[PDB]
């Protein structure tokens, strides 16, 4: 099944924007689709630049990262690790 995890954005989705950029590289290195979602219910598809811009406004908001696939854990873990600094 799919694997997601709620992560609170303390006015910093991670390191500047590398996290979002790296995600694109991770999706290619790891088998699984990663999707981001804001508490507002806005699906910030990690495969869309427009979505990344919307997340930026999520400074202090809660989001729900979802990952599907065999390495979904890695992808999700990698994103969470980057978000946690």
């Amino acid at each position: 099944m799919t694997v997601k995890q709620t992560v609170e954005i303390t006015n910093k989705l991670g390191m500047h924007a590398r996290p979002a950029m790296k995600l694109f590289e991770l999706m290619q290195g790891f088998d699984a689709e990663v999707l981001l979602r804001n508490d507002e219910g806005t699906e910030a598809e990690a495969n869309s630049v427009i979505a990344l811009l919307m997340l930026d406004s999520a400074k202090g908001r809660q989001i729900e990262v979802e990952a599907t696939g065999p390495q979904e854990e890695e992808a999700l873990a990698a994103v969470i690790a980057l978000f946690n600094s």
Binding site: A17, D56, S57, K59
Partner: protein, 255 residues
Amino acid sequence: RIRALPAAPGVAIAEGWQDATLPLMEQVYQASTLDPALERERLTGALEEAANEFRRYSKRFAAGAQKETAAIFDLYSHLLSDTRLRRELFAEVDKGSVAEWAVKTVIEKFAEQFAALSDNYLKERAGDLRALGQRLLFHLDDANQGPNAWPERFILVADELSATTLAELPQDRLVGVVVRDGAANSQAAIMVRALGIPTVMGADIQPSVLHRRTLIVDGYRGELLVDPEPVLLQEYQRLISEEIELSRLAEDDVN
């Protein structure tokens, strides 16, 4: 004799040259063309020439410039290459739109989407997008390209410091640049500053009377001289050679 805000300490002397970057939106035309595939394929072929050109561009910067630059471009490089942008353009053609205009329209439509964002930390990206389209416009025609102009020495003169603009001209031939705005910590203002290249802003002068005139930029004093009396410049050299060539040297201003 113009007082400009020094964004990056240092002094440099060279002529003033403006980038061949000029508005191409006024070239927007409406018409119907039969090239569904011809156009679609044309876009893909153009991307390979543009995408590869962009990836190679940043690659050169990372090898020298700074790491921030690569982070910025690298991010955009994947954008244009993103099957998302390509598919979008092809979508317009599916109706009978022309890449030339289609690509411009698609980029224009996105410009509004990028702005909609409030977070300037990235929203500003819009400005970068516009530059990306300009590159595609030229790449869309193998009849237009080339370094655009690789001189021996000179400075960039733009109303606002645009990282994309610099990523177009060679730094080797580019030392400093004076803008009339590009204030704050703009992506191009933060990258250039960290690069250690003289930069000044607040210039309330037009590039029209700059063509290739002589302009001495002084990041240290963020001042801009204009073919001033050669005599004054002579003393300047002796002023620094004096001793206190650090602070601001005993000069006028508030005595």
